[PDB]
Design a protein around this nucleic acid. Structure first.
Ligand SMILES: [Mn+2]
Ligand SMILES: [Mn+2]
Ligand SMILES: [Mn+2]
Ligand code: NA
Length: 347
DNA sequence: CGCTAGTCGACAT
DNA sequence: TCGACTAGCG
């Protein structure tokens, strides 16, 4: 998540409605609807009590798209990424802290304070996501479980032309290179749209509108894969790239103390972390739904060795990757929890 | 002015 | 899964 990116390129956004893609295919970052659908029933999920309200919350969004001729492809998060394990461990640490502190407030009498901690300790399990998959499949809607982060899976579906828009709330999809991203879409279907081609209307970007330079700007500002240098945001990162009259990104990062004229010490591990993060935005493992196989988000280049890309995801057998993508195989237990088969009537 | 970190919000009755 | 918002800092 690039902080403040949406307010940094506002001049490239215009409010639209989902009718502009009537009769087209639009993928969805479905986990955003699960987080909003679980707030209305946070205390129930915190106490382990059975609840299916979030199932109905995600369905009114799906049924709303079906009413406008949209063919949604619900994409769901999968396994944990090694490049995101530091953030995933911290989020799991804060969910456990709010859960323990929320249960402590139940043993006192504070009902409003315990509810606030419950809404911040929401853990969207894969079983909760699989409930929405069953409800969406009962209505004839495609559902795809990403091998890891849904962000990379959404980026491939949009680049490969399978879908023409990505309905989401995260700003990372712009860094992955999505052509059309629809943000802040209410239950009625109204939101903002940011096209990758219209990024030139942002005067504060300069010549940093190409996919490679825009990807470099998001990482230097601070993403979930690599924390930014102390004092480096989107503006200063964009300033380094505008003045970067050099295609080699490694020498430009070392020279960040010169392009900005600041006392910036760059450890060597941060340089290896940038190459680690740039390859994750480029070569993260997605799932090809047509050919049914594990492929990187972008095709491998000649100046990269895929042997050093374990942090971007681990390959498995195409049959195992298919059962995970179909939601039949659980993410953690790796056991068959369902028996859906798309052959016996996206794929 | 730009960046950082904490807070409040997302639901809905 | 995320971001919007502002006070406090350089
Ligand atoms: Mn997760
Ligand atoms: Mn994501
Ligand atoms: Mn993301
Ligand atoms: Na930053």
């Amino acid at each position: 998540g690039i902080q403040g990116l949406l307010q940094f390129i506002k001049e490239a956004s215009e409010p639209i409605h989902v009718r502009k893609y009537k009769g087209q295919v639009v993928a969805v970052d479905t986990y955003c609807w699960l987080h909003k659908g679980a707030i209305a029933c946070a205390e129930k999920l915190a106490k382990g009590e059975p609840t299916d309200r979030y199932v109905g919350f995600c369905m009114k969004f799906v049924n709303m798209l079906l009413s406008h001729g949209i063919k949604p492809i619900l994409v769901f998060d999968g396994c944990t990424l090694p490049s995101k394990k530091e953030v995933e461990r911290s989020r799991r640490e804060r969910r456990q802290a709010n859960l323990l502190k929320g249960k402590q407030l139940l043993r006192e009498g504070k009902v409003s304070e315990a509810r606030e901690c419950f809404t911040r300790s929401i853990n969207i399990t894969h079983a909760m996501a699989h409930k929405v998959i069953k409800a969406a499949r009962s209505q004839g809607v495609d559902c795809l479980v990403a091998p890891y982060e849904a962000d990379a899976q959404l980026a491939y579906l949009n680049k490969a032309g399978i879908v023409q828009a990505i309905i989401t709330e995260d700003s990372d999809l712009l860094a992955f290179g999505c052509k059309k991203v629809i943000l802040k879409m209410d239950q009625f279907g109204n939101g903002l749209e940011i096209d990758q081609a219209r990024l030139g209307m942002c005067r504060q970007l300069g010549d940093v509108f190409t996919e490679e330079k825009f990807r470099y700007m998001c990482i230097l500002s601070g993403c979930d894969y690599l924390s930014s240098l102390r004092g480096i945001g989107l503006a200063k990162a964009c300033k380094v790239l505008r003045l970067a009259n050099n295609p080699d990104i490694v020498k430009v990062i070392k020279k960040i103390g010169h392009y900005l004229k600041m006392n910036i010490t760059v450890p060597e591990d941060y340089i290896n972390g940038f190459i680690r993060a740039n390859n994750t935005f480029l070569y993260q493992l997605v799932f090809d739904p047509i050919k049914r196989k594990l492929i990187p988000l972008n095709a491998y280049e000649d100046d990269v060795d895929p042997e050093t890309l374990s942090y971007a995801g681990q390959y498995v057998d195409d049959s195992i990757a298919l059962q995970i993508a179909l939601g039949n195989k659980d993410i953690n237990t790796f056991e068959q929890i369902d028996d859906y088969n798309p052959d016996t009537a996206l794929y």
